[PDB]
Design a protein around this ligand. Structure first.
Ligand SMILES: CCCCCCCCCCCCCCCCCC(=O)OC[C@H](COP(=O)([O-])OCC(O)COP(=O)([O-])OC[C@@H](COC(=O)CCCCCCCCCCCCCCCCC)OC(=O)CCCCCCCCCCCCCCCCC)OC(=O)CCCCCCCCCCCCCCCCC
Ligand code: SF4
Lengths: 56, 216
């Protein structure tokens, strides 16, 4: 937020709240648009034995 | 009829059924030809009574195990199709059908293959599986595919390339093959793998640990 301090105070008084604490517009806090690769585990049926389909 | 079965019938008729019957335990009658090969001092073919103990046979007719009896690692008692038994079982087991069945193996052809403690037990069974892979007639799906599959898995097991879980996988593969084939070659390929897994699982896991260690 680039709003000057007097306008910030006027906004806080008119709203009756601390508006700067919870700003609707989102800045740097949000997650990066580039992320590391995932690994994504597998399910309970990914076994090499004791896994006959007729039991599940 | 097997040649040995045919060739004892005239003698059986001449001397009578009872004479043949006296030898061996009950329901395990007569004499038997034994071929002792592998890690013995005097590999040989001998004739002996049916229910002779395996240790007596090896130490009497074959000259004993190479390097002494304490050097014995394993014995395949009835040809390549019978599961191997470790030394602790071979000490008191008898060489008849019923006793070897009780020992989780078979009398088979009564071909005793002896392996001492210097043997790569995984490699010998892998060679037997390769034999079965090269002898399969290929007619039925379980033998034609699964014996080759087991051969590949055992070739990897020799190096230790696999993971321990695959051991149980291999066991299941053998069970799939066994009893689902037209003839007993599938049984004869599944049984040695089952014997190796039953008695030498630590060796397989230990080899896999070494392979995982050296390859980082
Ligand atoms: C009633 C009159 C109120 C006072 C006049 C005024 O415009 O005050 C500006 C200024 C605006 O306050 P703000 O809302 O906090 O600033 C937000 C800007 O976007 C933050 O500034 P910015 O970086 O976005 O700059 C945008 C720029 C670009 O805007 C322009 O181009 C306008 C100038 C060309 C005409 O506007 C200006 O710099 C000049 C302001 C308008 C003057 C006309 O007022 C004050 O600084 C104090 C409060 C009132 C006095
Ligand atoms: S189990 Fe017997 S019939 Fe079937 S493929 Fe093997 S050798 Fe041929």
């Amino acid at each position: 937020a680039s709003a000057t301090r007097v306008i910030q105070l006027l906004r806080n008084w008119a709203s009756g709240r601390d508006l700067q604490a919870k700003l609707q517009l989102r800045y740097q806090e949000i997650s990066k648009r580039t992320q590391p690769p995932p690994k994504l585990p597998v399910g309970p049926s990914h076994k090499l034995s004791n896994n006959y389909y007729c039991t599940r | 009829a097997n040649v040995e079965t045919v060739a004892v019938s005239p003698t059986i008729c001449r001397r009578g059924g009872a004479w043949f019957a006296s030898f061996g335990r009950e329901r395990n009658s007569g004499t038997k030809l034994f071929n002792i090969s592998g890690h013995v001092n005097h590999p040989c073919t001998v004739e002996e009574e049916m229910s002779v103990p395996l240790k007596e046979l090896i130490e009497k007719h074959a000259g004993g195990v190479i390097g002494g009896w304490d050097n014995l690692l394993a014995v395949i008692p009835g040809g390549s199709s019978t599961p191997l038994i470790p030394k602790s079982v071979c000490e008191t087991v008898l060489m008849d059908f019923d006793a070897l069945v009780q020992a989780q193996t078979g009398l088979g052809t009564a071909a005793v293959i002896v392996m001492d403690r210097s043997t790569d037990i995984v490699k010998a069974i892998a060679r037997l599986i390769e034999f079965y892979k090269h002898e399969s007639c290929g007619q039925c799906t379980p033998c034609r595919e699964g014996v080759d599959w087991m051969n590949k898995v055992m070739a990897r097991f020799v190096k230790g390339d696999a993971r321990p879980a695959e051991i149980d996988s291999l066991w299941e593969i053998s069970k799939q093959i066994e009893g689902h084939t037209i003839c007993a070659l599938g049984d004869g390929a599944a049984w040695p793998v089952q014997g190796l897994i039953r008695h030498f699982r630590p060796e397989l896991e230990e080899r896999m640990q070494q392979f995982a260690l050296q390859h980082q």
